[PDB]
Amino acid sequence: QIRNMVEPMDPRTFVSNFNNRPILSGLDTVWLCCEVKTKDPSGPPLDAKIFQGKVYPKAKYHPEMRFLRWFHKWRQLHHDQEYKVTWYVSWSPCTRCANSVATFLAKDPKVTLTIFVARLYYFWKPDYQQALRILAEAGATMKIMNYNEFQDCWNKFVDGRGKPFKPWNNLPKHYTLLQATLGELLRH
Amino acid sequence: QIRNMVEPMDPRTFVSNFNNRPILSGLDTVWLCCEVKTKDPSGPPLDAKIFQGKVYPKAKYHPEMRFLRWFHKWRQLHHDQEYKVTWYVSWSPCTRCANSVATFLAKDPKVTLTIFVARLYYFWKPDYQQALRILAEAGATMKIMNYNEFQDCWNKFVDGRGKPFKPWNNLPKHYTLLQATLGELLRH
Ligand SMILES: [Zn+2]
Ligand SMILES: [Zn+2]
Structure with missing residues (x-):
């Protein structure tokens, strides 16, 4: 049970x-909740961690970059x-x-990533639209966080304190928008 | 010109x-701006009208229903x-x-409708989704109002008032969302 493997983030922070309002500003941070497993989806979570980084460049200090370096030494x-x-x-x-x-997923065919995004990031700038296509073109499975994955994220990475997940109103409203958007953007 | 054929609606009303923020309810009414034309769209508009109906049932007082009765009388x-x-x-x-x-578009193969929606109505409830999927059958061309269609509507149906159309913030961002949703819902 991964609640001990990580340093769970704050409820007011989560x-x-x-929050999956598609157009949102004032959140300068991006939080990555990581989870490693074997070719199995049924056994134990093998390792887990929470990365965080601020959005302004350099992109070398982004939570997906902190993962790539971490997972390199961990794979060893x-x-x-x-x-x-x-x-x-x-x-x-x-984009970067x-x-x-x-390039990572290409060099290393043994890993297969699955990203659940809460919000799509600059889904209107076409640079960022081809970023999502680049990922799904490298093998990465791209999806939108729905009610289950928001819940499953609360249980696993928060100071839940046994508290159960409390879903905001307009969650599946926003979900239907964001899924359909990701659906159109990935389409080719 | 058609600013003369109708009873132009108020600017603060339009x-x-x-407004195309995909999620809205503080809005009690539905406004339908109609326009009939010949086989050739480069000709002038034959007649035009503005309907209104409140959103609560029965559907007999909905702006797309007042049209169906009015257009039957006008066809004669x-x-x-x-x-x-x-x-x-x-x-x-x-849905109704x-x-x-x-069924109306079905009786008369001579008419071909094109509906431009500013917002999708209850786009998350699954019946309101096959609702758009019906009109897609029987031929209705479904589209989302982008800036051009908002502008062209201001010109034809809004009491211009000698002030120009000022498009609201995030209009073409909201367009991307609703356009993507509608597209996915119609293939679904
Ligand atoms: Zn980044
Ligand atoms: Zn109706």
């Missing part, structure tokens, strides 16, 4: 940065086998980071 | 009821030829209105 300490990573990230990847995660 | 006064109707309605259609318009 409700703020994982464990045996060569197929891994299944999955992210619960607050904002979608930026999407290129890094693509 | 920005109010045609002219010779039979092919009409190209186009709506600029603020909310998308409800969509049945009317589908």
